[PDB]
Amino acid sequence: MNLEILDLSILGFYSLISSNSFESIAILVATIMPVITELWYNYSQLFALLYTLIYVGAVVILFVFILSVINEKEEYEYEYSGLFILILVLLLDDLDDNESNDNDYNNVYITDYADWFNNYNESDLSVIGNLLFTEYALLLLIISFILLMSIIGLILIVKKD
């Protein structure tokens, strides 16, 4: 039983019924956690950890803004929905989870063959840094330039002075 399917089923239910802004900042965290875990267990543990290191800091800053802008509006308001229309919507959605229509690509299993030629064996992050700091160093230096612009941009927007 792939229990990640159940997790996304609950998350989709709570995204349809979410009312206030605090629930939305919880839908975000309830989305990154399935992403981080599935990356950890299937494809990339490096990027599972990079997601946690960067998105959490963004989440708390996002949460602190909710405190300064919460404006009483959706606590006392009413929503109608209907339990039957919610579950029927989620049932129809769950029916079609085939993002791709290449049946052979989705059904036939493949393998790779290992070789011993790579005797200098290092992590993916060392190769990523090796290329990023040598061949795509321009991409890194532009990213540094964009980060500098954000620093100036945030000040010229928020600072009253």
Next chain:
Amino acid sequence: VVYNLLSVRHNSRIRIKTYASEVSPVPSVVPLFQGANWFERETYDLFGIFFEGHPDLRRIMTDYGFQGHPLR
């Protein structure tokens, strides 16, 4: 109504006595002495003396919505 004043310059003390009734307004010295703000509030709270010109005159010692002026 009794006002005890202190002069740190000359190291001297003086007293001012004035009179009042239950309905006769009394001038407030809060504009002159900002330290009289609470003392006038206490005097009103426990006696019921009408301090005209007090920026915020109200109960300071008795319970909220207390009927009566205890020191009479």
Next chain:
Amino acid sequence: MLQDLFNNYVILVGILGLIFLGVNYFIVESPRMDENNGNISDYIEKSGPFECGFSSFEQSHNPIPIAFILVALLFLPFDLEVSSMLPYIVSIYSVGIYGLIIFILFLLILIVGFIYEFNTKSLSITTILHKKNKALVKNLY
């Protein structure tokens, strides 16, 4: 590398957290064994917010001004800069002097942001009151 032992530990941590809630739930005497003031739902005098004894305005959903919001926003650009050094940490030897110079250039462009924030005093606290000393002057005649 095998992480099957790590998987069992994570499972135990998840179960262990629910044990504290459950054990406290099964151990506490039922309210009828206590003073018997009913279920906690009815006892609104207990479930109300703490305000040191005196009730006040219920301002839960009102907005709260935040004096350090600019510093909080600038945390994100600097957090990304710190996370950008991770590729260099584990590849310092391979990139050699070429990568080291590029690493310095990455940091030198971001140091202009540090100079900018210092000179603009953007990392201060945004007070709404200001204490200024007025001068007393006499328009004599």
Next chain:
Amino acid sequence: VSTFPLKSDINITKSGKTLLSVGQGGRSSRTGFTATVFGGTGFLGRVVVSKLAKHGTNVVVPFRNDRARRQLKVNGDLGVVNFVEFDIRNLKSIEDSVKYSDIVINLIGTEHFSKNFSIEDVNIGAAERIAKAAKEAGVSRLIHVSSYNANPSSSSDFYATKGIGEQVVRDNFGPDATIVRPAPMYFRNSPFLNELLQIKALGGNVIFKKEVYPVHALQVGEAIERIAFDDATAGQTYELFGKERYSKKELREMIKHIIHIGQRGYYPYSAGFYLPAPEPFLYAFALIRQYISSQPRFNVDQLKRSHINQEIDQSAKTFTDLGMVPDELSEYLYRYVKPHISYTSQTQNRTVYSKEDIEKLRDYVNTP
């Protein structure tokens, strides 16, 4: 309540004592009476003990729970409230409670049974024992509180034992024993309203169809005060009920709107507000929890009583015989379900349901 609960400052008990009263009726005053309230730590005892102790009547409160009795001492002045550790299986402790009292009030009664006490032990065995112990101690007035549908020949083990308990109280204490038959009582932390205010009420489609004539608990506590201090009420049976008849389905639905659980079209159905179940499942679950759960849950006999509606005994006396007007649940329903309203807390504007608004809501509930 009032300021002085007596028509005079002198009262001669039917046992021969003459009791004078002192003071104007405050905490420092006395009425000269000593009363014993069995079951004073219960829901109704706290109402009764508070009304007796506030006017200076010495109250003996026999307790089995040491924590529950502590709040009773605050009701009276020094020396007014007295505690006796007791058990209905202990005879010396029962006599000690009534040894000095001129009035004995019996509020002991359960709708459940446990490993130690059956419904026959409490609703009959305790009531009979207390009535006899009261008589040997020379108590002038006995007041026994049965249920609203007391009947010695009832299909319900609670209604039957309550009905038999009425008989045994008169057969021991004599014809002068007074009997009270309260309807379901509503108040703060009321057992009647608590099951209606609970969210996850299983099998409400069966349980909540019973119709009743609910009565304010303060009036029932006030009526008992009238009965004890007026000897013309000896040997009488009182049916204390409200003027209006409600079915628990109506009140359950009326409460839902006051709690504003219906603000969402999905939330009540998702949260378990409606939990329909076949009656055999309700029987098995009630039967199973009777030997597994340690706390008194909805038992088998309460399932049977869900079908039996409240029948007012027409030969008994009412509030009007005591010179009192019954309160209306419409004028008190809001303030007693007010603690359970979800957001409230001066968010935008409270919806204070007046007496007129509650009756308007009742029609809307009954509209399909």
Next chain:
Amino acid sequence: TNPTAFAQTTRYVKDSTEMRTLVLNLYRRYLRHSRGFVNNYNLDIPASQVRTKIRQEFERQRFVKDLPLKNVLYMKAQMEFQELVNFWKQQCHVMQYFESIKGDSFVQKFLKGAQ
């Protein structure tokens, strides 16, 4: 220093016409804040009942003639208003304020010791 919210400076009014206007303005403020009183103090009655209670207290002092008594009554009515709006009174005090309310015959009082 600064005064608290809804604070008025104390002044001795010497004109009955000016006093009458000040009383009517304050009476309107009591009516407008009636819904606020129900919200803050969690009363079990509608705001319509609160406004009725306010009118009764103003009707009690309807026929006070002496000007010095008017100023003291007005000053005390302003203090109470500042107390209610700012939520300085505890909820128990406001609940008991609405708890306020046939006299017995001679014999009835005689039997119970009278007053």
Next chain:
Amino acid sequence: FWPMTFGLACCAVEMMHVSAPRYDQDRLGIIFRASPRQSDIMIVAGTVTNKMAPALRQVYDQMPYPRWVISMGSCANGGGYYHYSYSVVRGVDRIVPVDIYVPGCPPTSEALMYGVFQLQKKMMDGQTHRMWYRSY
């Protein structure tokens, strides 16, 4: 034994000296908590006035069970020096149940510790779970 910080008047000075190094209540496991949620003992150390009584009752009601109340000093016991005052409650037991009464004006630190030891003795006699077995 976690009392709630509720020092009202000169009776609070002696309660602060119980935490002082000479007596050091902390060695007995006694820690003062600011919030009523973390407290199970309420020590009323000082005069209870009419202006304070509703706040005192609200603070008491917010303590989760099991909760005990200690009344310390003549003010809290029966009013004391201010018994005939227009603005004093004549005993804290008119507002909250009291489990033990500590006498003195003020009670000494040892007098308060003795009162705590009496409460701990009564707490060790509790039979809540055997009450369920044998009385219910």
Next chain:
Amino acid sequence: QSASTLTKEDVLTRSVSVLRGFEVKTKDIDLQTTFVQDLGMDSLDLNDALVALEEEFDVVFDDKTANEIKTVGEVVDFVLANYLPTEQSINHTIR
């Protein structure tokens, strides 16, 4: 959005209904209808009506105007000239 949608006929119509729920001498209310003469309101009744007309239209009469108001038409004039919709949150408008 942040502008009035009031007409003279609606404000008069809502004013009449709110004034009909009081104890007035006549139910025939128009613009020229005075409060003291036609409806018969003393000092306290008039201010009960003004606050009632305040709550209906979510407006607040100033002290100078309220003390000097005579006719029903004056109220309708005041509401039309001074009514503003209440500001909404930063999300109600742009979303």
Next chain:
Amino acid sequence: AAQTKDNNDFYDVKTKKNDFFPVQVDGIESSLGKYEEFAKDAHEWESWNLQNEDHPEYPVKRTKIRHFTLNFGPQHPAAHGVLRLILELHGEEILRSDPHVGLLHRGTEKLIESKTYMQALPYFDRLDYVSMMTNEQVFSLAVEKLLNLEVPERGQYIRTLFGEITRVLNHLMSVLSHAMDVGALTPFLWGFEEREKLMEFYERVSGARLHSAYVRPGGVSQDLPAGLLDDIYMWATQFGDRLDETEELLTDSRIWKQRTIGIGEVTAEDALNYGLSGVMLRGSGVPFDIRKSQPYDAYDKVDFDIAVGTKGDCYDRYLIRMTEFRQSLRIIEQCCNQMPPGPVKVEDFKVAPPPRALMKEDMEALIHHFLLYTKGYAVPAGETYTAIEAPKGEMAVYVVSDGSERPYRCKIRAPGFAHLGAFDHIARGHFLPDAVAIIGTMDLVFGEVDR
């Protein structure tokens, strides 16, 4: 002030002044017609709005929202007892402070009129209940002044000796509790053991650790027990190290100075106008002390120095209160070395009780003992305003005598009452943690404030 059209209790319509020209626009038209031809349907066309929200005079009805209002109520460690400090915050910045008191108002002044002068004395033990003996002294001085009596020489020195022991007892409570509220827990524990040693001297002379009705009109209730001065002198030999160790954790600490430097600044003008006295006045540059201005009870026969600040903030007053620690210890040593022999109470049995041995042999002693405890002593009609340098500041009593054995009126001037009345002026601008520092630097005991 007054409900107006654009400003009332519930909302306001705020318009700024127009910086730009009042430009006139007439004849609005589109390419299909004039404005009036489509103005009926222009309500649905956002591009047809003639009112611009950036204009300074754009009408906006804004509800008046209560600012963040916090009850810094009685149940709070910062408040030294029962203080319902109501703060209107902007985040954590204080905008307005409303100290609500009377939670410890017990009607002491009302009750005193019902008591004789001897019976009313213990009431003073319970106003400033860490500086107990100083409170008794100001009442005793006022009654002695009205009685036209004076304490003998040894009695005056005893009141000076325990006047400075009491001052140390107060500053240990004040300085260390203020430090503990800032976050320095350890100095509180060290110095409270010094309080235990000092309260041992309190208990040996009177029999009560705290409420020692020992200073009475005419002298002291009982003489010093044998061996007391040696214990006091032995304590004094070590107390210098205790003060130094406390200063090791606070005085030069950068964290302590960041919490106190520039916090709660008070100008010398505002200190006088608001009636601040003692350390609050002296921290602002004013060198005024009541022990020097109006000397009393052998303070003229000892030597001490007054510390005066220059910046009038919390750090200046901390240094001043630490100097007074050492100046009191200087006085304590002198009193121990200069205590004279002789009677401790006035030699008058119409005011002071006779000895028990004389009471049970002399008829006139037994009459005076009988009359003192059943009627008190009459005080000539008059009034007085007597002030002392209490550890909190200037404490004074305004006593009115009607010629009887009971005081007609007794108004107690509490230094903390005046200090708390300036809190809103001082704490404005500062943040919520700074209110904790300002409260602790005033030395607020609310029994004194409320009484």
